[PDB]
């Protein structure tokens, strides 16, 4: 029995329609089939689901670790059993091929079950401390309301990656997904929670654009944390709302990034082309760790951009329900032109065109580029579409000048057949993460998640996790007069 | 020998005169008179200083843990040499009592301890992974540049909580003082770190106008990090332009909060008053740990009211120099303005005035308010002088509504015999720190230092000094081929 009345959104505790009056039409990227309609969200709405969320909260954390923890496990149940229904609802309202949405569902699966051992984790400490009869304590409690914003592209494992540990370790959420997925944004992931027994009122969903409900979803004074995934200019909105608004909070801050491709000259060059084509064409580009510009040192280039090119033109565009689909179709309209836009500006540049897809429909082909400068739009600017551009190093200095050129490093690859020589490269790599001999697409359960400069704010994951979605209470309890010198 | 020319600011590895062309005067708030006069800053000094950081740092990272550790060990030496010396400025500059400005300094001696040993204690590490023939390495190393602004408040120590920390660990360190304290700004620390032995260029100190250059230090884009200190109206704009800005860094915010100090009904009275006493005076009460709101439960409220008020004639305004003095001068005549217009404005508010001390020239001797409601400004608004609202609580319950109804939690103190009540009453509270029949102003090395709310992002001292001051960096290294669908 799949899942039906998706249009109604948790709010305060139960399921009911918003009270904007506003519709929103949820459609298939690819056919243009309407999915259903929901009634918006309300900026009372909001209010009320903060509020509801802040109520419930302290018996949420007042259970004990190993009830919170069965309704996560619980949760992982549900995956296994709504696995087809899961993953057919990523293909249809996100655009996403079927063999995406069944990575998504499996990085969604994993980091509801890494969560589920997070309660028995976490704990507090006791310090010693000079002042005779002080005992200085620290206690490790949830924060309390953590708001969550989701992207488009992975809509469900990013809100998943939030919440799910969030309300593992006693927090409480609410969540705005992108217009664009308001049923893997959380919808569904709150009906997935409410079959796994989460109490009333802990998850809810706040459908709405966030143009216009999203200031008051960070402004607001109920949340004591705001973690969000997306564009850098939004990303800078909301930072500047939370960090500089009437009510400060914390923020957890993923923007897009600017990944490099780095090929040095004794690179495998096999390995190194499988892994830029699948490390791009995985999702059409739509994601933040896909690689942006490919940067092959000179010895290779030639070599390297004809075995890509090769590649690039085997890839099927088409239909995303069948499991050889390589290439889905564009999320939405104005993406789709945002493309095409950067497509025709690659060509006004001087970037040499390697291959032109067609575009048909929604449906946008791979389009390659060569001969490519670091001051380039289509080196430059984050690309969530199947545009790639190629780069030309000299030297591996020059290679490593061209990588860091970029505003934003969130992650990155750096291929070489000598192991010590692609690390120190990736030493010296200003981005968070990155992935030696490999594609620089991976996320795994206990590792550190995160950009540095314009791409990140804080880490995800693992023990990363535990400290990200608790706060820590400096409690001194003195047991004896203190002398005060006045 | 003592320190001379010290209007000689560090710059791109040069003690050299500011390019701003404006020249500020460092004056005694007690007497008036002149410690010295500064050559500004211009934003040129300010762009030479974090290009020079930027260059001079990694090979200051790349030193091993022990080298880095004995320049803090050597400052330490220092501390204890200059001792008196460096007391005796933070008198004169910032309008300290003695007895706070020993404070002060035993405080500074202790973080630039505890920094020596976190070089040592900086790991990465070796995860499992999933992914066969993949090994995942997660590395820890220091963010680059760091940028410091510190308040006049408590310039030594709370410059030196960032800066030794952060030298520690490999960044290079940026200062911008507060304009009325340069020299115990950092001037101060910048010669204490040169004597220890710390490269130049590693530490350079920026003295300009907040409002001319403040944009461009937090907007540069070489710093990794910024940590404030200071009130939440300039909080907010320096968390406005690093979040928001151009060029996006992480910020360390400590923002003055109103801090909610609670004597329940069956608390010691004598330790209560004593330590409202000693939390809310220590230095004139300019700390963001000081008591803002006294909330007491209405059967002890009485009793309590006399006793702080016979206890607060007794405390003696006078020149900061003695040993004996409890308050001193208030730092700066624009403070000193806004502190008797929320004296005046309490009046209006209709608060029961218990103590109406003088104000003489810079010198504000303790005024107390009672009968105070929460919606009053001087309960809502954190004050930083020697002025203190009463507050009255029917019930525990009431007490804690009180507490929790600011919109900044920094520190908080609950009095109370029964101890297992009163660290019940602490979880409640939504502050970072609570000290239960004890003062709220405490600060330890070991311990965590923060705020929450309107009142604080990040964490200082310890392991968190730690976390604060790296950066860490996921790497995973593929040693058999992977494949891909
Ligand atoms: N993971 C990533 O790094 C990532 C993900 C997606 C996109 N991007 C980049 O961003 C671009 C796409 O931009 P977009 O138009 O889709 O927006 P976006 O920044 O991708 O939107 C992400 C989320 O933020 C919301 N949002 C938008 N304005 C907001 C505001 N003022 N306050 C709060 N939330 C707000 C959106 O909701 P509404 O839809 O209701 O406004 C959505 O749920 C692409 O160029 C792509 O490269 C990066
Ligand atoms: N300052 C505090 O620690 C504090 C704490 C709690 C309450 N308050 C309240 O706030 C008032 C006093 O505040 P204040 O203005 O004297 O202290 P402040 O300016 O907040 O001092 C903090 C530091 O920030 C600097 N600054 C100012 N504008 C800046 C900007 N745009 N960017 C970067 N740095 C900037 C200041 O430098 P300059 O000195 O060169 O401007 C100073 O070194 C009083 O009403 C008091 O009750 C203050």
């Not at 949820?26 to 109520?55: C, H, M, T």
């Not at 430059?380 to 545009?387: H, W």
């Not at 030696?436 to 996320?443: G, K, L």
């Not at 998640?449 to 880490?459: A, D, T």
Request: hydrophobic content about 45%.
């Amino acid at each position: 029995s799949r899942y039906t009345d998706l249009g109604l959104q948790p709010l305060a505790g139960e399921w009911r329609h918003g009270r904007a009056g506003r519709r929103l039409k949820v459609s298939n990227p690819f056919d243009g089939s309407l999915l259903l309609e929901i009634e918006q969200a309300d900026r009372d709405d909001l209010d009320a689901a903060y509020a509801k969320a802040a109520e419930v909260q302290p018996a949420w954390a007042a259970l004990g670790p190993s009830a919170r923890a069965a309704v996560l496990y619980k949760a992982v149940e549900v995956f296994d059993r709504r696995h087809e229904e899961i993953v057919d609802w990523i293909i249809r309202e996100s655009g996403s091929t079927r063999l995406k949405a069944e990575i998504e569902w499996g990085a969604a699966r994993a980091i509801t079950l890494e969560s589920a051992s997070f309660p028995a984790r976490v704990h507090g400490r006791i310090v010693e401390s000079d002042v005779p009869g002080k005992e200085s304590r620290v206690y490790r409690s949830a924060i309390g309301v953590v708001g969550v914003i989701s992207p488009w592209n992975f809509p469900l494992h990013l809100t998943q990656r939030s919440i799910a540990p969030a309300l593992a370790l006693g927090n409480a959420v609410v969540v705005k997904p992108a217009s664009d997925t308001p049923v893997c944004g959380g919808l569904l992931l709150a009906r997935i929670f409410e079959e796994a027994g989460l109490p009333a009122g802990l998850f809810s969903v706040v459908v709405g654009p966030g143009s216009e409900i999203g200031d008051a979803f960070v402004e607001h004074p109920v949340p004591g944390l705001v973690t969000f995934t997306g564009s850098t200019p939004v990303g800078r909105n909301i930072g500047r709302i939370a960090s500089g608004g009437a009510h400060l909070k914390h923020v957890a801050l993923e923007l897009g990034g600017n990944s490099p491709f780095v090929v040095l000259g004794d690179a495998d060059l096999e390995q190194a082309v499988s892994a830029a084509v699948f490390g791009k064409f995985l999702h059409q580009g739509q994601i933040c760790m896909a690689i942006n510009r490919i940067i092959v040192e000179d010895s290779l280039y030639d070599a390297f951009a004809a075995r890509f090119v090769e590649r690039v033109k085997g890839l099927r565009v088409g239909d995303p329900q069948r499991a050889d689909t390589a290439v889905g179709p564009i999320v939405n309209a104005r993406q789709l032109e945002g493309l095409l836009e950067k497509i025709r500006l690659a060509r006004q540049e001087g970037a040499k065109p390697l291959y032109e897809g067609g575009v048909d429909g929604q449906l946008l082909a791979p389009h390659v580029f060569g001969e490519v400068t670091a001051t380039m739009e289509i080196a430059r600017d984050e690309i969530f579409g199947p545009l790639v551009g190629l780069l030309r190093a000299r030297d591996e200095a020059h290679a490593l000048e061209l990588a860091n050129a970029s505003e934003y490093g969130l992650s990155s690859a750096v291929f070489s057949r000598d192991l010590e020589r692609a690390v120190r490269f990736a030493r010296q790599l200003r981005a968070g993460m990155t992935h030696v001999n490999d594609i620089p697409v991976n996320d795994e359960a206990n590792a550190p998640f995160g950009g540095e400069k314009n791409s990140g704010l804080g880490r995800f994951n693992g023990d990363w996790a535990i400290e990200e979605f608790t706060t820590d209470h400096w409690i001194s309890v003195q047991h004896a007069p203190r002398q005060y010198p006045f």
